[PDB]
Symmetry: C2
């Protein structure tokens, strides 16, 4: 029931995500990483595609004890000559964060085409990424979340 998503599984999945992205939009011209969860994935993908145009955007949930919890911050200003953009995240749960990221990116950059890719996606998500690899299990620990604290404690 408890899945540890390991670095080795991530390498294999990253190569498959590359294949699946190239099939829909070709090689992207730039990446937007949905911080924090997309950072390691976007680092590996940007080096694989030899892409230096990498931008970040933050999706952060705050306590509504406020009108809306989710808040999208640090909106990048993508350069004019970049038109095919891949937005990268590691898991899509409800889809609310990714949908909000795309909506702001498209509003600010109406000339560009944004595609989205995730490693994992809940089947019941209200909003889904253009490309995803695996249905999200109920309970999942990612190596970037747990390996450093597990090493420290052993």
């Amino acid at each position: 029931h408890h899945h540890h998503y390991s670095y080795e599984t991530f390498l294999k999945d990253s190569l498959e995500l590359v294949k699946q992205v190239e099939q829909i939009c070709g090689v992207p011209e730039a990446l937007v990483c949905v911080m924090r969860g997309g950072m390691t994935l976007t680092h590996f993908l940007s080096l694989h595609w030899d892409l230096r145009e990498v931008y970040g955007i933050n999706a952060i949930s705050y306590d509504t004890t406020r009108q809306n919890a989710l808040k999208i911050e640090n909106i990048p200003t993508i350069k004019d000559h970049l038109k095919t953009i891949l937005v990268v995240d590691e898991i899509v749960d409800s889809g609310n964060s990714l949908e909000a990221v795309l909506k702001v990116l498209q509003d600010k950059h109406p000339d560009k085409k944004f595609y989205s890719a995730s490693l994992f996606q809940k089947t019941s998500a209200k909003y889904k990424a253009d490309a995803f690899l695996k249905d999200a299990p109920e309970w999942i620990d990612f190596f970037w979340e747990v390996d450093l604290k597990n090493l420290k404690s052993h």
Copy 2:
């Protein structure tokens, strides 16, 4: 010419715990991170999760500094994260632009590797950089794709 050094994932985990300890000694747990993209991305991801920090900003790098973040007013202790400092020109210029823009904040810098000959050195670094070192985030996929 130069011998081939390589930085694996397992080495990165052990060194990241040491980097955490040394940053904590110098400035405490940071209130926010600035990742020097691309090379700091994986490191900053792991550090932000370890310290439960959601305030993570990016910046990219003669040459000009691009995509300069605007850091929230209340965040005072900021850690700038890179994986290697070679000449030191990029890190020096990143710090210059951040400090000019946010003069009331305290910026500290950390890197895994640091050239001994660099003109500018990070406040915290763990290892001397050899002439040729490659990193798991650069090479592991290409090897896996080969096999």
